[PDB]
């Protein structure tokens, strides 16, 4: 997250960290035993870290749970990043409280203009590199359909949307991938891709979660 603020410890209670020995992706908790992330964050051997702020210190509210199975979206295309979404089941149910809670799936897609919260432990610099230990937050609007397509000609599909600032300076970045875009108390997006970070005219692109509700709910009822 570039141009963001320190969220505050456990104030994004649905944010999770995917650790394979180090944090590499973000995710969102959607129930006691299921996490949603970005398919391009898939790897064998994941541990899900819940209740994290500082990801290099044990502060007393963490739950570390191993993944029992991962399910990449059937139609994920890793060359164009369409359907960049995956599901992770946890080996045991998380214990939910005020500091570890799930976020709600949308019933309706969110419109352009809507202000959302984006969070993660990715790089905080637009040029060069500096990774924060504590979670960072950014409020950003969903951009029009049109604007998103003219910023990335030929690359935006019906399952992506852009959010951020076309003036630059505020954006998601490397290490934020798979993390939540929450708008009016629900999960509208997943940090998926962009062109550098916080460049003029190139806003971050997110997986449109509203298009996948049906698939998630069918998948978690049978697995």
UniProtKB/Swiss-Prot annotation:
Location within or outside the cell: Secreted, Extracellular space
The molecular function terms in GO held by this entry are: endopeptidase activity; metal ion binding; serine-type endopeptidase activity; serpin family protein binding
**Entry PTM:** Subsequent cleavage after Lys-125 leads to alpha-trypsin. Further cleavage after Lys-170 yields pseudotrypsin. A cleavage may also occur after Arg-99. Not sulfated on tyrosine residue(s).
Give the catalysed reaction(s), semicolon-separated. Preferential cleavage: Arg-|-Xaa, Lys-|-Xaa
Which cysteines share a disulfide bond? Answer: 7-137, 25-41, 109-210, 116-183, 148-162, 173-197
The GO cellular component terms are: extracellular space; serine protease inhibitor complex
Q: Can the keyword Transcription regulation be found in this entry's annotation?
A: no
Which residues are annotated as active site?
Answer: 40 (charge relay system), 84 (charge relay system), 177 (charge relay system)
List the Gene3D superfamilies.
Trypsin-like serine proteases
Q: How is the cofactor bound?
A: Binds 1 Ca(2+) ion per subunit.
Residues the entry annotates as binding substrate: 171-172, 174-175, 177
Positions bound to Ca(2+): 52, 54, 57, 62
User: Could you tell me which residue ranges the Peptidase S1 domain spans?
Assistant: 1-221
Q: What is its main location?
A: secreted
Q: What is its EC number?
A: 3.4.21.4
Q: What class of enzyme is it?
A: hydrolase
Any idea which UniProt keywords this protein has? Calcium, Digestion, Disulfide bond, Hydrolase, Metal-binding, Protease, Secreted, Serine protease, Signal, Zymogen
* Tissue note: Synthesized in the acinar cells of the pancreas.
**Quaternary structure annotation from Swiss-Prot or TrEMBL:** Interacts with SERPINA1.
Please report which protein family the annotation says this sequence is part of. Belongs to the peptidase S1 family.
**Name of protein:** Serine protease 1
Q: Which organism is it from?
A: Bos taurus (Bovine)
